Symmetry: C3
């Protein structure tokens, strides 16, 4: 029953303690409250009626903003994003390049506008402030964790840019973990446009802030002592659009290459596997077989653990975007394998994070430019930070599966 | 009758004098001849039969070059830019991304070729020379004003690059104004492809050179004393294509975001306005209500001033590209509001300029890279330069409305 | 009969000797073996049954990898790259932008992966080693020649990056020639997707390594004495995808502009030619008339020399991509002129090279960044290097025509 989920949470916590830089330095108030907040946040918005309605209200607003942004997309690509496409090409009428990627551009511009207006800083200041008061975490790392709810791993530390170079190793690690445990407002809308339930995306985003601090302070407790704009709104929007464009181009090229490379890998695996009586061997089977125990531990039913393992493994060995690209068909009526609604939720939560090895190089560049003398520390803590970020996503999935 | 237009010209002139840095320093020969040239140029090509035929001949040549350039576009996107699109998707068969944006690439390559060959420098030298002889303006600022007829605000000063750092404040201001009062050959073809009459675009482009000098020397008279390549033609074309590509990408991302943001703004305005019994409230209504007097002043009929105000206001608060994107449907048979041919012309002229606040940041980067120690002056004069550029566009529209 | 081909080879060799920096410094072992290898390589894979089967086996593998990579393309553009496009738009259903350009992205990512794994370095070390042992060429220039079989002119010298600044002038020239005589794995797949026979592309690529050294050591003999990474595999793929994206964008913009410019040139040539009773005058006719003797010399039949001259000339005056874009329709059933299979092969080989004037500027940037103090030498030897590269392509075509 629910016992398997509670065991799941315990195992995830235990692994973090086992990988800790110093278990005797672990602050019980910090890691105790962090888990408490992430657990309670999950309980509130996924179980408690009022919180469920607040989540639903927030998600529908996000859904409306996406539709508003699609007017710009409709202007540029016209009939290629109209209903006629489904009449002519059927399911192939949904052109990913024109349906999903332009949303990254619109949302990046929007976020930039909300930063210029001070709306973002206002929300981050409140959320980040509440975290440090309850957990005893430092001012800077708490703000970065809260900022990561809405923006990406390289953009979130910008709210505390001047404090980054003199951050303690534990602070720097938490900052890295905050980004790895979360996603970004831009791609959230993208994943939502792919069929992923907005409620899950919004929930996982908010739960990433305490979850990121949780596993950061478990695996890298504080052993040191911490310390302590565009000309107009139109310029802000333009700057965001440009950043979104570059992101859209990068994501699109990555998807073309990685999905293509997976197909090539599967072709080779067919020949190699055939030598062992397994000509049907594919990458999905390997990842499914290898990540099935992990999926089962976080609450996925026995008969759905292997399929769930495919996406979870793919997210880890590559990135969450590619994983979502393969999981999205399972959210439609044309799903090759009909999964339970709880399993769908677990996969959605467990995928909702930038936690992968390639994000280390991203952190080295973006976060490293803010503090060039700390690039050595970032590379040194990269793998552990990814692990911490992965555990945070897994914990969020286990919690979500519990109240569902 | 025509009295309203003459009042319009007077008001525009008066505002410039009211905003002058020193009215007693205004050179009557300079600003008198500048208005005379812009007025006579308008009279010649819009009223006088011979000039009308020369304008028509030039516009058709421009129309032919665009069709020639569309062969490259047709090669890349094939059936998606063919007539079959209109059979399948109807009006939505016109894909803006593939129809309009690639023209920016072809024309940028062409302009780069005409620069390598010396054709551009030849024309600019003649036009710029005639301006300084008649107006008494300096050599450098006259060439920049003439260059702005064909190229953008950041590219035009390149013809006098080494003279920019030591320019007087009045010279630097005029250079800024020359770019703000005009557009570029690349986007001109884009706007033409959207349905905007080429004759109006060509006319407004040429009239921008004296018009830009007019309001620059009215608002910032000279109080000081002025002073005074690719390896081959194929490389030139390639360089232009690359520049055009970057422009095309920037414009496309901007349009997706801004049009999307306008839709979001209208959604919010519907709720906010509803609190005051105006749930139908939209951005177009605000801009229309606010810019209707200005439209009426430049010659737009009373019953068309509000609709004309929508586009004029949008051009000012955002940019001319977005404005043209909303005005283009009014140039087709499927126009939601059938406007008079004079009103169509007035709007076309009044929109034909880079005069907006966001162009200040553009000038800071492009023009600023030519003279890094003058970036402070550019930012200081930015708003006034935009105003001067706006007045120049408005004057051109009033003149156009007069002879029509 | 075959006598015309042997004369062709002799003429090409003679021209190189005539243009030599020092004929008495020409190493007979080097240039004798280089021609021997290129000739024997051609004989082996185009005539000898076993070699023909090895070429066919390699080409089919390349064909399979391309299809695998098209899965990523199919994901992004859906129905726009499906069979339905041919039902709706007929021949125009083949959208070049979505069919060909994305292959550059996938293959660039793949090559980057094969570099990270050490597979590329392994092959290059063997091929490059065999060349220097047989020809007596230096270690560095032999590796660069072998690397150019698979990658582009700017990427190939990276395998010997630290040796480039101290290279002899003859070494630097050979390095330039190796890149000009060949293409790249990315665009090879692109040309293959356009209908160009993979066997010819693969053959020309391998034959470029000895061919490049041949004409480099003929035109610039050695008169001096020579001397002597991404964090993980996923990062490698991502880096390659990004590089491929930039390449894809550059190629697409170039094609839009150049094909558009050719159409404009033809429009002007129609008017100019009309003054001399030739209103049908076009660029293709000029290039065809001018390059027909050259085509005839390399083995193209008399009645097909003019048509063959169009593409060969276009490749030289512009680039091979544009040439292939005009030659591709002649490889289909809807070919305006049905050409012999030997003529098709000759054109395919003669076009398979980056040898053009615009590549000089490319070499100045890419190869020049590896040795900034040698940019003067690169520019000085640019034209001769292009000639050498052109002769190498022509020789490969003549050889191919001989055994066919
Ligand atoms: C898509 C389908 C197929 C999936 C295939 C799975 C591929 C996963 C292999 C990952 O390889 C490792 O990744 C690390 C992370 O980058 C590297 O560490 C490098 O970077 C670390 C992080 O900074 C450092 O700690 C290390 O010292 C440094 O070796 C490490 O060398 C590398 O071997
Ligand atoms: C699209 C639909 C919605 C439309 C909404 C309308 C938005 C317009 C607001 C413009 O805001 C102002 O723009 C100036 C121009 O950038 C800024 O001046 C800044 O830049 C100037 C120019 O250099 C300087 O003179 C100023 O000192 C400096 O404050 C100024 O601060 C800023 O408040
Ligand atoms: C597409 C259809 C139409 C086709 C039209 C054909 C155009 C071909 C003209 C080429 O022009 C030459 O190209 C050289 C190569 O770049 C230039 O040399 C320049 O660069 C060389 C190479 O480094 C140097 O040796 C030279 O000194 C330097 O002048 C040279 O000046 C330039 O006149
Ligand atoms: O804002 C972003 N920042 C970022 O780094 N990414 C990277 O792109 C990958 C795919 O979304 C993520 O795993 C992450 O590594 C994506 C983003 F959308
Ligand atoms: O060449 C150009 N230069 C330029 O700055 N722009 C900018 O892009 C906006 C939209 O066309 C213009 O208002 C102007 O600010 C556009 C151009 F086409
Ligand atoms: O890898 C490449 N490197 C390169 O320089 N190019 C350039 O792009 C032109 C068109 O393919 C080539 O002639 C060559 O000059 C293309 C490439 F694909
Ligand atoms: Na984040
Ligand atoms: Na201009
Ligand atoms: Na090469």
């Amino acid at each position: 029953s629910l016992f398997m989920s509670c065991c799941g949470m315990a195992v995830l916590l235990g692994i973090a303690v086992l990988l800790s830089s110093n278990r005797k330095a672990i602050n019980l108030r910090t890691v105790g409250g962090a888990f408490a907040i992430q657990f309670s946040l999950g309980a509130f918005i996924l179980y408690v009626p009022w919180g469920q309605e607040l989540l639903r209200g927030f998600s529908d607003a996000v859904s409306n903003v996406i539709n508003y942004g699609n007017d710009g997309t409709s202007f540029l690509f016209g009939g290629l994003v109209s209903g006629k496409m489904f009449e002519v090409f059927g399911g192939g009428g949904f052109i990913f390049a024109f349906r999903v990627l332009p949303t990254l551009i619109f949302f990046s511009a929007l976020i930039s506008v909300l930063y210029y207006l001070g709306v973002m800083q206002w929300v981050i200041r409140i959320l980040g402030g509440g975290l440090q008061k309850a957990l005893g975490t430092s001012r800077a790392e708490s703000m970065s964790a809260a900022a990561n709810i809405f923006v990406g791993q390289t953009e979130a530390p910008l709210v505390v840019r001047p404090f980054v170079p003199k951050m303690t190793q534990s602070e720097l690690f938490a900052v890295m973990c905050g980004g790895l445990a979360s996603i970004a407002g831009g791609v959230l809308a993208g994943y939502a446009s792919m069929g992923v339930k907005i409620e899950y995306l919004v929930a996982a985003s908010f739960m990433a802030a305490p979850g990121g601090l949780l596993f950061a302070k478990l695996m890298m407790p504080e052993t040191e002592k911490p310390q302590d704009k565009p000309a107009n709104v139109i310029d802000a929007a333009a700057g965001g659009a440009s950043a979104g464009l570059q992101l859209a181009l990068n994501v699109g090229a990555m998807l073309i290459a990685f999905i293509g490379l997976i197909a090539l890998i599967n072709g080779m695996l067919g020949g190699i596997g055939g030598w062992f009586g397994m000509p049907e061997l594919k990458l999905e089977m390997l990842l499914g077989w290898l990540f099935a125990p992990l999926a089962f531990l976080i609450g996925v039913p026995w008969n759905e653990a292997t399929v769930a393992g495919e996406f979870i493994g793919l997210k880890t060995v590559a990135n969450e975007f590619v994983a979502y690209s393969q999981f999205a068909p399972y959210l439609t009526e044309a799903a090759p394998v009909v999964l339970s609604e709880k399993t769908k939720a677990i996969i959605s939560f467990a995928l909702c994070g930038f936690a992968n090895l390639s994000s280390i190089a991203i952190l080295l560049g973006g976060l490293g430019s803010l503090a060039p003398k700390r690039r050595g520390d970032i590379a040194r803590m990269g793998v552990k930070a990814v692990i911490a970020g992965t555990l945070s996503n897994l914990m969020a999935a286990t919690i979500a599966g519990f109240f569902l």
